[PDB]
């Protein structure tokens, strides 16, 4: 039930700033070979150590097919080490609180007051969307993306 994007297995590395206060962003994306289904934890991006999110656009394609869509995505700081490939991973909703995007291919920004206040840890953490509510009948190969304006060396 783990979808390890290229940014978590180590195939594609993530940029880390070489200064303090210098924002950094990278388009963490997937090409979902299968179709999203309830319970999937799409490990898409990693947030480097000593960095905190500052602003986050979540950009996804059209993940529904029929009328009255109900797919909901929540984004959180996943607990386990990077690229563990273990179903025991928990995920969360620190970044996005069950965003309604996915019913139509669109762009959403971090509208929560908890996305901008995230503590830092000296070890890499993986940022992964989870399909909280199951999608309406119908889906296909689409690209879920999440750019993550994080900054290193805060206080």
């Amino acid at each position: 039930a783990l979808i390890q994007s290229d940014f978590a297995q180590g195939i594609r590395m993530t940029p880390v700033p070489d200064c303090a206060g210098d924002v950094t962003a990278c388009r963490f994306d997937i090409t979902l070979k299968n179709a999203p289904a309830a319970g999937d934890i799409i490990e898409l991006g990693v947030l480097p150590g000593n960095a905190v999110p500052v602003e986050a656009i979540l950009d996804v394609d059209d993940l529904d097919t029929g009328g009255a869509p109900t797919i909901t995505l929540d984004v959180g700081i996943m607990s386990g080490p990077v690229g563990k490939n273990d179903p025991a991973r928990t995920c969360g909703n620190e970044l996005f609180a069950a965003s309604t995007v996915g019913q139509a291919g669109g762009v959403v920004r971090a509208t929560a007051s908890s996305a901008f206040r995230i503590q830092k840890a000296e070890d890499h953490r993986s940022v992964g969307v989870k399909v909280a509510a199951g999608p309406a009948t119908g889906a296909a190969g689409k690209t879920i993306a999440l750019i993550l304006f994080y900054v290193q060396g805060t206080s």
């Binding site: 297995q9 180590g10 195939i11 594609r12 940029p15 880390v16 700033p17 890499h124």
Partner: protein
């Protein structure tokens, strides 16, 4: 003194090279080290030789 010794593996570098003149500073692959541990306990056994009878 110890009851546990840990030894590490340094896995290969897997990543994408930056073709052309794309800037590479700041996109630096992190060395991944994997850990393992072995633990030591005693293993004893005893045999008996009967009595004086």
């Amino acid at each position: 003194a110890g009851d546990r010794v840990s030894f590490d593996l340094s896995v290969r570098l897997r990543g994408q090279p930056t073709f052309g003149d794309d800037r590479v500073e700041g996109k630096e692959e992190n060395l991944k080290f994997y850990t393992d541990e072995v633990i030591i306990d005693q293993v004893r056994h005893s045999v008996s030789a009967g009595g004086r009878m």
